Design a protein around this nucleic acid. Structure first.
Ligand SMILES: Nc1ncnc2c1ncn2[C@@H]1O[C@H](COP(=O)(O)OP(=O)(O)NP(=O)(O)O)[C@@H](O)[C@H]1O
Ligand SMILES: Nc1ncnc2c1ncn2[C@@H]1O[C@H](CSCC[C@H](N)C(=O)O)[C@@H](O)[C@H]1O
Ligand SMILES: [Mg+2]
Ligand SMILES: [Zn+2]
Ligand SMILES: [Zn+2]
Ligand SMILES: [Zn+2]
Ligand SMILES: [Zn+2]
Ligand SMILES: [Zn+2]
Length: 1880
DNA sequence: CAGCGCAT
DNA sequence: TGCGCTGACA
């Protein structure tokens, strides 16, 4: 609107200050003293930002300089004060605005400091949560509330300290006049005025009011009026849409916000919420507005299952609450009715409000009043405005502002209520201009000028002396013209072959399974695949990483061009020549304005290169100071497309911004050559002529966009011609290019704006041209009457700021209609011309490279953090014109990285490319030993120490100092550049030693003497392609090593494999010669992305660890090897160390699971009979009864591993350490317990060092005072404050060896303790070693002691967050992860040995028991399965009593955490009559008829309840009627009286129809019959009003009763829907005759009685029976078989084929489930000798299985109990004595199936197929379970059974896993016979 | 933290 | 024209 488009906050502020010059006269009044400003309530501290930008504009314009002195501010928020103290850091920060009235006010930290009152301007805004808050329905009144809390707090201070200016702000509807009375009551005068934001440069529309009051004046000059006039003087009304203020969808901010905002309501998605009371308003609105009950934008069924379009932020809508979504759809319809098309017209809605409160939409280019609770929906981007965009719609710049720990709710709150920085800037500047005099002077000017110059000088010296490596240079001369030769057809091929095939990829990478439509040419992923479904035949194309295509395309094209031209008169030649042809004669004014503005890009202003882009088809954009040129590189006819930039300051409605809007003078490449630029440069003159054009219709008449959309008003049944024939006259056609007179067909599927994509029918008058389309395209800002149809050759979404090439537009009056032979007028523009003879032609650079890496390695003496070792420096000639801003005329301007410095680097990339890559630095070079760690500060700041106060965490001030001292780290890869007199230069260098100190930082320190040794290297030309493979680790073998050939004193020999392994273990423990066995390092990266470099600095230290992980396949003798190792090593004298701290023993403790405590000593005694004493501990008491003098004798001690959780252990250790009584008392969690246990271990080792002398006391006594003195701190508390000896703790000794066993089952609480046990050699035994990923190897290393790397987030598939923040986090590349993998593989090669056992083979016959489920349980499980199918495999659990269908559910979904798990677990058990304990074997038919009878009872119960509620409501209504409340006039749509009109009309009732008939019968069986509104109820029961409270109260009670009615109606519909299905399945099972009876079809039309035998399938959730062909055809289109009367939402999934559930085999054995019943007969069939061991997986079924076996004549033994009992039961089950429990029930995935050496049994049962995800993990645990019986001492043949269901998921996952195994590695299948045992 | 609600 | 509040919910 007649104003220049302003979008940059800096520009609008310097404009603001440029409009008034009466402010520079302030800095003379201040006389050199800085303003002293204070702010009472300030969220984003918008006043401070405004003042800082005003100061910047002052210094930039007038040369002057005024500073500021923030005295204080206050915010009782928890995090807004954190944000303040991290950005501005004021000296004092109170937390209140009413305490400051006192002399000793409180501080945000609690210091209770005194208040300073030397302010110069106090700017504060009272809060709004009570000042009528028109969102809020409650309101506080008359100074009882806000004006007594905050305002009366502010008044006392402002009176007690008299600041010369105070400016207030609050909402419009406020008691302001009373505020003026309060202020003028004492001193002030206080005029107040209101003003919006949309009047100050910003489109935001939010409105507020301001106030200003200077202390009393003598003569009362009436300042506030002059203030108001000065403010309202300066204004400028929003010359730009909001889209200019939004971020582009590509930058990492938008990705980082979508990843967080996409999953807000998360493993199991939360419960289906309730909105019924608003659902009523939605239905009423859809009815009143004549809209149709569709859901266009998002075809949602439930809350979380929906499918937005392929341009919508789908991962947002999936997360939305359902009311929000339905509101989106009602807004779309209510808008699409008016004619405009949301989704193509930019405008912000508000959604967090209600349908009723949606006035003011259909209004574009203005945001609404942002509030912290709204959710705005842009409707054109298709998603919400994120945090930083909600900031930018205020004045606040997200730049230069550090937002750490800020989420979308927090950004919403901050930028929601903060006053617009431009409004506040203007009001404050007018204050400071009108009351300039009142502020005093400084009286010290020259000292201030000197201070300013001094600080500027030291800063300009710093960045200059940053670089310290100019010693070495070579000065290789540089040839900028580094073009190459290429066939230019293969490169266009490779350009088409590597380009964005979905919005998912986005300029970086590749996503698979692209679907390319046929006849529309629109590619898109399979995910987010088109809901506007196209033809979509799969795409056939290979994929080349964009990295390769860019690497070649750079080298192919020049780095600069310039259009030769000499076209001053060529334009007039072209004009006359074109006039000779037929084209619109151009005016004089248009020609002049166009030519004179074009003649500056043709001037010899050379084009540079920048940001070759990938959006689609790889445009490569060049740029000059005034023009822009960009080779398009289309997949057909590549062209160049020059364009000219309109000037900076020029209003929007200007002729030049119309003439230079579209490109001019394109050039089409000569294909099939070697030169990338050959064409003749045709031109585009501003010619605009109009032509008549006849439009006609053909083909049939498809439904219009309205009718297809679902409208029901006068739009229902409206059509449009399916094909259009365009007829242009001969000459008027042959004047222009791209003839148009063909015919165009419609594509209702291939969407566009208003679904009007007309693809031209192929014609052979031209083949060299691309395909042409004819559609609509709205303006996106202007009203929709002006939009027009258009002819173009492109069709896609366009981002703000880029237009599309069109051939011609059509009159703004023609629409797809019904009439034919309509004659309209087309208009052509920019009619091109023949080709001029102008063309483009391309065109002492020098760069320093380090000669060799030796020169550098000396310069970094020590503390290389202070300086930078220079790497490159390029001196390049640049003309003094068009030298960019970054080029500074002296003193080496510094570029900032990961900040505003990204266009700076993209500007000079034309020099960056074409530079030889640095070589000879690939190797790791520098080495310097740093014995101690001594982490360099400013490089690795110490974290705040977390301390315990509970019986605070992350001390505030320390957190602030941390998050500040992390942004001032040395920042490797510093890049500075400076422009000389002619030739500029820049110096890229990195702080090598900073990298090295950061790498050293990450090693955790030990009490050792091994010294680190740093390094460094720089590798060029790295690019990110994709994580294409996944590494698979390899565990070596122990075969090749020789053998020790015997251990002495064994009763039985070891085999040769075991001998080789024992010898390897001996040697590995010894390690003769070598002094360290492994090196561990943490390579730290720092990428300079734009140049191809990435740096790496490492820090490695050797570590001597003896012992390693032996993980041998099941059956091998790991126990035997360990006992042999102990027996062998026994004789040796002692190890190498000295162990002075704590006590050393000779015993070798073995940590085993709870139930192996009898298996281990038995094996030890069996092999070496009484060779050495072996003391066992199982219970805590067995530990406490021992003494150290007794442990000394013990050669080997066996320890159960649950004492570490016995929790008496932790108490006794709390005593030996002398800690508080509950220092180590923590719940199951082993977090925060590691630090506490570490401190306890330090204190314990000191105490034991003391106790070695027997001087027991006086130390535990000395530490109590230490702790109770340390506690005394000013922080947050709960209040003002607060030899031999029995029972030794095992953490105070040191053994010769510690051999864990089954280590991968050591849970958190006991892992965190076994990790601390101290010994010389530490061996680990396992059978299933986790080697899948890097975390599973790190978890092994931590047992060993190695570090082996730190934990990053990306390596996969709150406390310390200060280092996990996108501003303080690392960006570790892919090569980093590959090096970490190589390191894990090296550790595995060194310390891990797996090898195959070659004892002998075990027969291993296999069986399988598969059966069908009954009809009743079949139906139940099918209902559950279809539920989860329609919910997309996610567990969702869900007044009026629940039905039976919802009762079979909410029981399966109770504890299930995964969809597949609720199915594995359902098929097992099916108990009928869930309410009563009564039970007996009921036949199948009995079960089904019981189900159906219970459902009939439920239905009639709901019926009677509904009628009861109607009677109560009609009594209420008669009450109100007689008591004269509706007045029978001035209607207000009485709710109940309307619901009774709705319900009567049967055709209006959505949902099933039979339920509607039930409702009508029940309602007419009452006082209402054909809209009666009776006077009395049908029971004559009393209305239950309390005491006749009020009339409106009764109206409210009625308004609630009616919603209760409506809810009950929905519930009744569901009831009938479920009853029908169970009844029909009962009939299908009932018998053949009744099956024929019920097989009366859905009126589908055909059935076995009339037509031949046709498999006709029953549908679930409606109960309708129809033919499978009709069933599929109907369900695919999302509509039931009954056309428009079933009204149920149908998925293709829930289609149950008849006769797919069984009755045949009389499988009546539904007692305790039909699975567990088939188990018991099996177990009886097993002979009486053999033992059995069942393998269930889900613990929650142990009860049901032990209730089935028990009371099923079979006794068993479960392995549950305590650490003492499990060993005994396992021992008796292994034992030789007869008549134990025959079957033993094992839990899989539990420490009970760890390794048991039980071979008494010979066959498993293994009921439910294993579910676990990983195939390798599946295989490992299944072979472990099998091998539990297939062992060495077997002496028998083994069987394996399986109980799988034919219907369920069991057979599915069984087939998947078994086939995938049979294809993969050997895993030799088991013979698989069939069972005919029958032993009893 | 999702519903619910008409005025200065 | 709206810088929510208040019962339920994990
Ligand atoms: N040299 C040997 N002479 C006699 N028996 C042996 C010998 N080596 C192993 N065994 C027996 O072979 C069986 C193997 O069990 P064991 O080696 O203790 O299993 P594990 O490897 O510790 N557990 P797991 O593999 O997970 O099932 C035991 O009964 C051993 O006593
Ligand atoms: N004692 C107090 N009374 C009112 N608000 C307080 C307060 N202490 C802190 N606040 C916070 O201060 C804010 C009030 S409004 C602050 C924003 C203001 N428009 C500006 O930009 O300066 C709220 O976030 C509120 O939570
Ligand atoms: Mg074992
Ligand atoms: Zn298509
Ligand atoms: Zn995609
Ligand atoms: Zn350092
Ligand atoms: Zn149906
Ligand atoms: Zn049918």
């Amino acid at each position: 609107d007649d104003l220049p488009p302003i979008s940059d906050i800096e520009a609008m502020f310097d404009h603001l200050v440029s409009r008034i010059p009466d402010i520079v006269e302030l800095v003379r009044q201040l006389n050199g003293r800085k303003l002293r400003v204070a702010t009472m309530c300030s969220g984003t501290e918008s006043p401070l930002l405004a003042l800082n930008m005003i100061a910047k504009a002052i210094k930039a314009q007038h040369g002057l300089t005024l500073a500021f002195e923030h005295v204080f501010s206050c915010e009782i928020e928890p995090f807004k004060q954190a944000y303040i103290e991290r950005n501005f850091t004021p000296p004092i920060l109170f937390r209140d605005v009413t305490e400051l009235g006192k002399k000793r006010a409180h501080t945000a930290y609690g210091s209770m400091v005194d208040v300073p009152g030397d302010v110069d301007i106090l700017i504060a805004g009272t809060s709004c949560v009570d000042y009528s808050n028109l969102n809020n329905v409650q309101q506080d009144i008359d100074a009882n509330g806000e004006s007594g809390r905050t305002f009366r707090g502010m008044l006392q201070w402002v009176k007690k300290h008299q600041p010369p200016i105070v400016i207030l702000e609050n909402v419009c509807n406020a008691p302001w006049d009373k505020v003026v009375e309060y202020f003028g009551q004492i001193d002030y005068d206080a005029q107040y005025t209101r003003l919006d934001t949309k009047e100050f440069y910003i489109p935001h529309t939010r409105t507020r009011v301001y106030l200003f009051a200077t202390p009393s004046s003598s003569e009362s000059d009436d300042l506030p009026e002059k203030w108001a006039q000065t403010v309202k003087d300066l204004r400028r009304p929003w010359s730009s849409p909001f889209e200019a203020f939004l971020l582009h969808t590509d930058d990492p901010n938008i990705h980082r916000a979508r990843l967080e905002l996409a999953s807000a309501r998360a493993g199991t998605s939360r419960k289906t919420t309730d909105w019924n009371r608003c659902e009523s308003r939605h239905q009423r609105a859809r009815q009143d507005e004549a809209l149709g009950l569709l859901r266009p934008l998002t075809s949602w069924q439930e809350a979380g299952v929906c499918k937005g379009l392929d341009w919508t932020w789908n991962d947002w809508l999936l997360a939305q609450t359902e009311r929000v979504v339905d509101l989106l759809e009602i807004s779309t319809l209510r808008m699409a009715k008016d004619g405009i098309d949301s989704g193509f017209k930019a405008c912000i809605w508000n959604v967090s409000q209600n349908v009723d409160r949606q006035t003011g939409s259909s209004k574009t280019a203005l945001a609404p009043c942002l509030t912290p609770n709204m959710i705005p929906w842009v409707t054109i981007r298709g998603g919400p405005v994120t945090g930083r965009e909600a900031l930018a719609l205020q004045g606040i710049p997200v730049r230069e502002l550090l937002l750490t720990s800020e989420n979308e709710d927090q950004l919403a709150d901050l930028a929601g209520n903060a006053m617009t920085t431009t409004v506040v800037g203007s009001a404050m500047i007018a204050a400071l201009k009108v009351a300039c005099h009142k502020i005093t002077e400084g009286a010290n000017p020259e000292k201030e000028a000197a201070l300013i110059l001094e600080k500027e000088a030291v800063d300009d010296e710093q960045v200059a002396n940053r670089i310290i490596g100019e010693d070495y240079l070579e000065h290789h001369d540089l040839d900028l013209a580094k073009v190459t030769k290429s066939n230019l057809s293969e490169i266009l091929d490779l350009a088409c072959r590597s380009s964005r095939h979905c919005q998912c990829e986005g300029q970086s990478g590749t996503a698979p399974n692209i679907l390319e439509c046929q006849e529309c040419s629109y590619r898109a992923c399979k995910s987010c695949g088109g809901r506007p479904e196209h033809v979509y035949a799969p795409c056939a194309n290979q994929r080349v990483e964009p990295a390769e295509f860019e690497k070649r395309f750079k080298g192919l094209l020049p780095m600069r061009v310039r259009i030769a031209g000499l076209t001053d008169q060529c334009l007039n030649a072209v004009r006359k020549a074109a006039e000779k042809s037929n084209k619109g004669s151009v005016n004089d004014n248009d020609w002049q304005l166009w030519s004179t503005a074009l003649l500056e890009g043709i001037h010899d202003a050379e084009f540079r290169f920048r940001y070759l882009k990938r959006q689609s088809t790889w445009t490569a954009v060049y740029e000059a100071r005034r023009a822009m040129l960009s080779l398009v590189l289309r997949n057909q006819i590549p062209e160049w497309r020059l364009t000219i930039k309109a000037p900076a300051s020029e209003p929007n409605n200007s002729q030049l911004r119309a003439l230079l809007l579209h490109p001019v003078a394109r050039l089409q490449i000569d294909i099939a050559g070697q030169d990338v630029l050959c064409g003749p440069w045709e031109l585009c003159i501003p010619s605009m002529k109009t032509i008549d054009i006849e439009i006609t219709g053909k083909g049939e008449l498809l439904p219009s966009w309205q009718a297809s959309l679902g409208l029901q008003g006068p739009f229902a049944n409206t059509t449009r011609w399916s094909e259009v024939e365009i007829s242009l006259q001969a000459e008027d056609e042959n004047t222009l290019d791209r003839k148009l007179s063909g015919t165009y067909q419609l594509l209702p599927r291939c969407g566009q704006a208003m679904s009007s994509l007309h693809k031209k029918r192929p014609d052979l008058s031209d083949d060299g041209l691309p395909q042409l389309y004819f559609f609509l395209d709205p303006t996106r800002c202007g009203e929709s009457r002006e939009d027009r149809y258009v002819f173009s050759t492109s069709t896609e979404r366009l981002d703000y700021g880029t237009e599309r090439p069109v051939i011609a537009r059509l009159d703004s009056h023609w629409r797809e209609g019904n009439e034919k032979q309509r004659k309209v007028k087309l208009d052509v523009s920019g009619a091109w011309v023949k080709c001029p003879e102008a063309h483009l032609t391309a065109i002492r650079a020098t760069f320093a490279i380090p000669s060799s890496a030796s020169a550098i390695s000396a310069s970094l003496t020590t503390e290389g953090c202070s300086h930078a070792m220079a790497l490159l420096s390029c001196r390049v000639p640049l003309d003094p014109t068009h030298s960019e801003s970054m080029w500074r005329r002296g003193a080496w301007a510094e570029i900032d990285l990961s900040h505003q410095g990204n266009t700076t680097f993209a500007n000079l990339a034309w020099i960056t490319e074409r530079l030889p890559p640095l070589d000879g630095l690939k190797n790791w070079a520098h080495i310097a030993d740093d014995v101690s760690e001594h982490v360099c500060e400013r490089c690795a700041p110490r974290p705040p120490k977390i301390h315990w106060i509970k019986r605070a965490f992350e001390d505030k001030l320390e957190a602030g100092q941390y998050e500040h001292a992390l942004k001032h780290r040395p920042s490797p890869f510093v890049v500075q550049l400076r422009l000389d007199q002619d030739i500029g230069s820049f110096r890229i260098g990195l702080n090598i030693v900073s990298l090295a100190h950061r790498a050293l930082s990450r090693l955790p320190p030990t009490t050792s003497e091994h010294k680190i040794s740093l390094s460094w290297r720089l590798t060029p030309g790295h690019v990110t392609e994709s994580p294409q493979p996944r590494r698979v680790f390899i565990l070596p073998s122990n075969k090749q090593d020789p053998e020790n050939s015997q251990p002495e004193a064994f009763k039985l020999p070891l085999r040769k494999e075991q001998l080789r392994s024992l010898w390897w273990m001996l040697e590995q423990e010894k390690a003769t010669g070598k002094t360290h066995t492994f090196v561990e390092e943490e390579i730290s990266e720092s990428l300079l992305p734009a140049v191809g470099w990435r740096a790496e600095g490492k820090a490695e230290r050797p570590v001597m660890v003896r012992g390693g992980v032996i993980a041998d396949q099941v059956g091998y003798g790991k126990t035997v090897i360990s006992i042999a190792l102990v027996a062998q090593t026994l004789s040796l004298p002692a190890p190498e160390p000295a162990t002075p701290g704590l006590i050393d023993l000779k015993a070798t403790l073995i940590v085993v699971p709870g139930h192996l405590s009898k298996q281990w000593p038995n094996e030890i005694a069996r092999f070496t009979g009484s060779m050495f004493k072996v003391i066992v501990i199982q219970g805590m008491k067995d530990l406490q009864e021992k003494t150290i003098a007794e442990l000394g004798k013990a050669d080997i001690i066996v320890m159960a591993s649950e004492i570490f959780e016995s929790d008496v252990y932790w108490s006794r250790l709390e005593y030996l350490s002398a800690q508080p009584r509950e220092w180590l008392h923590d719940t199951q969690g082993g977090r925060f317990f590691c630090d506490r246990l570490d401190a306890a271990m330090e204190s314990l080792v000191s105490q034991t060092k003391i106790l070695k002398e027997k001087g027991s006391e006086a130390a535990m006594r000395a530490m109590e005072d230490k702790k109770k003195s340390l506690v005394d701190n000013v922080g947050s508390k709960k209040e003002v404050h607060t030899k031999l000896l029995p029972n030794p703790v095992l953490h105070m000794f040191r053994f010769r060896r510690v051999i864990a066993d089954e280590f991968t089952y050591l849970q958190k609480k006991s892992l965190a303790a076994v990790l601390r046990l101290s010994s010389s050699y530490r061996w680990i035994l396992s059978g299933t070693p986790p080697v899948s990923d890097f975390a599973a190897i790190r978890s092994i290393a931590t047992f060993m002691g190695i570090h082996l790397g730190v934990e990053d987030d990306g390596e996969g598939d709150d406390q310390t967050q200060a280092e996990k923040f996108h501003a303080f986090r690392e960006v570790h590349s892919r090569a980093w992860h590959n090096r970490r993998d190589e390191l894990a593989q090296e550790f595995l090669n060194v310390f891990v040995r797996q090898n195959i056992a070659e004892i002998e083979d075990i027969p291993t016959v296999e069986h399988i028991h598969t059966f069908k489920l009954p009809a009743s349980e079949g139906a139940v499980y099918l209902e559950l399965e279809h539920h989860l199918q329609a919910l997309e495999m996610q567990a969702r659990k869900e007044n009026v009593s629940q039905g039976d269908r919802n009762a079979r559910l909410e029981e399966a979904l109770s504890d299930s955490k995964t969809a597949e798990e609720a199915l594995l677990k359902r098929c097992c058990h099916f108990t009928l009559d869930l309410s009563d304990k009564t039970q007996d074997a009921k036949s199948a038919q009995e079960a089904c008829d019981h189900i159906t009878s219970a459902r009939a009872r439920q239905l009639l119960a709901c019926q009677e309840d509904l009628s009861r509620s109607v009677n109560q409501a009609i009594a209420l209504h008669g009450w109100i009627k007689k008591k004269g409340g509706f007045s029978k006039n001035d209607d207000e749509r009485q709710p109940f009286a309307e619901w009774i009109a709705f319900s009567s009309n049967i055709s209006k009732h959505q949902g099933d129809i039979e339920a509607a008939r039930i409702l009508l019968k029940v309602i007419e069986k009452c006082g209402v019959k054909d809209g009666n509104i009776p006077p009395s109820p049908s029971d004559k029961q009393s209305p239950s009003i309390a005491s006749g409270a009020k009339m409106d109260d009764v109206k409210w009670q009625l308004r609630e009763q009616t919603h209760l009615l409506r809810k009950l109606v929905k519930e009744l519909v569901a009831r009938v829907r479920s009853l029908r299905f169970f009844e029909v399945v009962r009939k299908i099972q009932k018998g053949k005759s009744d099956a024929q009876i019920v097989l009366e079809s859905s009126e589908c039309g055909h059935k076995p009685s009339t037509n031949p035998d046709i498999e006709m399938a029953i549908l679930s959730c409606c109960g309708h029976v129809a033919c499978h062909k009709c069933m599929r055809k109907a369900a695919a289109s999302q509509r039931c078989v009954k056309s428009g009367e079933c009204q149920a939402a149908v998925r293709p999934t829930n289609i149950v084929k008849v006769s797919s559930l069984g009755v045949e085999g009389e499988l009546s054995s539904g007692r305790y489930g039909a699975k567990l019943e088939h188990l018991v007969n099996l177990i009886h069939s097993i002979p009486k000798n053999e033992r059995v061991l069942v393998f269930l997986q889900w613990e929650d079924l142990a009860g049901k299985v032990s209730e089935a076996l028990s009371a099923g004549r079979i006794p068993h033994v479960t392995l549950s109990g305590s650490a003492k009992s499990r060993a005994n039961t396992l021992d008796r089950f292994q034992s030789t004595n007869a008549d134990s429990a025959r079957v033993l029930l094992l839990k899989m995935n539990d420490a009970s199936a760890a390794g048991s050496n039980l071979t008494t049994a010979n066959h498993a049962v293994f009921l439910g197929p294993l579910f676990t995800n990983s195939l390798f993990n599946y295989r490992a645990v299944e072979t472990q379970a099998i091998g539990r019986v297939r062992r060495y001492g077997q002496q028998k043949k083994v069987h394996i059974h399986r109980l799988l269901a034919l219907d369920t998921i069991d057979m599915t996952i069984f087939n998947a896993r078994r086939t995938e195994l049979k294809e993969k590695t050997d895993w030799e299948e088991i013979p698989q016979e069939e069972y005919k045992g029958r032993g009893s």
